[PDB]
Structures are given as C-alpha cells and as structure tokens.
C-alpha cells in the first residue's frame, strides 16, 4: 500500500492557531475532499476537535493516548495501530496536524501540499522536509477570486 500526507500551508509552514485554520480558501478544501474521498484519513485528536464531526464517506482514524469519547470513529493509540485500522486500502491519507504530520512524514511516499500565499501567526507548523527526497508531478496555481481570498497553489510531491 501507501501513505500519503495531505495538508495546506501558510507562509513559513503554518498550518494552525489556536487549534484553528487561520484561513478560509473553499477551493482548497474541495481539493481536499476530492483527495480523501472513499479512504481512511488518520488525524490526531486536536484535529478531531477542530474538524467537530466525522467527516462524512471516510473512515475516520483518531489518534490518542487516551480512552476513545466518540464511537462514530476509530481510536488507536500508536502509528503502527493507526495504520493497521486502516485495512488493506490502495492509499491511506494522514491528515494531520503537527504532531501527527511529524510521525508519518518519513512513511509516506506521497505529499498533497496546498501552499497558501497568506500570511499567518501560527502555533502549528507542517514538518521541514529535506526537498531532496521528494519529485513535483503536479503544480496547480490559482490567483485569488471573489470566493477565495488568497492565491495558492496545489502541489503533489512523491517520494524519490
Ligand atoms: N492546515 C492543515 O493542513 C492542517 C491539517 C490538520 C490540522 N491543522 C491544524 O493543526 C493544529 C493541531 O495540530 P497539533 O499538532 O496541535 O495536534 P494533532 O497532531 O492534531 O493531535 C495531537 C494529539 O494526537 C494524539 N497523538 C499524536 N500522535 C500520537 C501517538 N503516536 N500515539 C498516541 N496519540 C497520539 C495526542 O492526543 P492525546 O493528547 O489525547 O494523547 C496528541 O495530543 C490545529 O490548529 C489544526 O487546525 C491544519
Ligand atoms: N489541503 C488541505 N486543506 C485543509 O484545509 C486541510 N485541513 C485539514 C484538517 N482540517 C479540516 C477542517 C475541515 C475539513 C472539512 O470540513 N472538510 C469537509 C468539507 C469539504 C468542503 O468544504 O469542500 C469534507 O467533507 O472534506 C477538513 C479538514 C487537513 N488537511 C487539509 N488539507
């Protein structure tokens, strides 16, 4: 199979404040419904708690060190569990935040990167990955409009 990481990033990689996504770009968050559609997408549980709800035609895979509070969604307690409770799936789409993007990033073959030209004060930044390891097969760029007020650009990175 495959592990594949999915996020948007602000300048110098910010990608949450105060457990929130410090923008709002509906094209980017189509984008990522489009690539999570029908795939099991692990998070950890701050992102539960600022997504609020499971998102819908995904199973969900939470991770935490504590007791599950929810059982409309899957709870492990380590990567190698999380992963497990995937099943067998073609791509397994880890979706965050920080601490989680950290712990799957040298797993993964595969980075779906929205960079947002936004400037932000953030908490939570996506890992630094060594741009060595990691080929461009596909670049999207989109200027601003009436309903998304930032340009930004979609990004597909695999593993080299
Ligand atoms: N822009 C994006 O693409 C994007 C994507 C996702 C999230 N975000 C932002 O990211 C921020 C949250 O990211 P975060 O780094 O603060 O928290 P997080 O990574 O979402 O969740 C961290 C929590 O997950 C659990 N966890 C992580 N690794 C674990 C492990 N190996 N074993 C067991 N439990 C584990 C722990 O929960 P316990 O404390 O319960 O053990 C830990 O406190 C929010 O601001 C959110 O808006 C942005
Ligand atoms: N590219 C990308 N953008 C993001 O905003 C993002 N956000 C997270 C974590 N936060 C969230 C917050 C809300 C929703 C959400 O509401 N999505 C719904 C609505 C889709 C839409 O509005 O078009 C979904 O069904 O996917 C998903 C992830 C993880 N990876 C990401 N990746």
Same mark, same amino acid.
């Given at each position: ?5 999915? @996020?948007? /990033? ?7 404040? !105060?457990?929130?996504? %410090? $923008?709002? /770009?509906?094209?980017?968050?189509? $984008? ?11 998070? *950890? ?5 600022? +997504?609020?709800? %499971?998102?819908? *035609?995904?199973?969900? +895979? +939470? ?20 992963? @497990?409770?995937? *099943?067998?799936? %073609? !791509? ?5 935040? *920080? ?11 595969? /980075?779906?990167?929205?960079? +947002? ?9 996506? %890992? ?5 390891? $990691? ?8 200027? @601003? ?9 979609? !990004? ?5």
């Amino acid at each position: 199979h495959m592990i594949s990481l999915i @996020a948007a /990033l602000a300048v110098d990689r910010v990608i949450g404040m !105060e457990n929130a996504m %410090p $923008w709002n /770009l509906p094209a980017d968050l189509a $984008w990522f419904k489009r690539n999570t559609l029908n795939k099991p997408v692990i998070m *950890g549980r701050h992102t539960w708690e600022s +997504i609020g709800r %499971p998102l819908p *035609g995904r199973k969900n +895979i +939470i991770l935490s060190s504590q007791p599950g509070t929810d059982d409309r969604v899957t709870w492990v307690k380590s990567v190698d569990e999380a992963i @497990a409770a995937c *099943g067998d799936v %073609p !791509e397994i789409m880890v979706i965050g935040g *920080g601490r989680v993007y950290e712990q799957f990033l040298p797993k993964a073959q595969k /980075l779906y990167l929205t960079h +947002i030209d936004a400037e932000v004060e953030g908490d939570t930044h996506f %890992p630094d990955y060594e741009p060595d390891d $990691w080929e461009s097969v596909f670049s999207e760029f989109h200027d @601003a409009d009436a309903q998304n007020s930032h340009s930004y650009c979609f !990004e597909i990175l695999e593993r080299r």
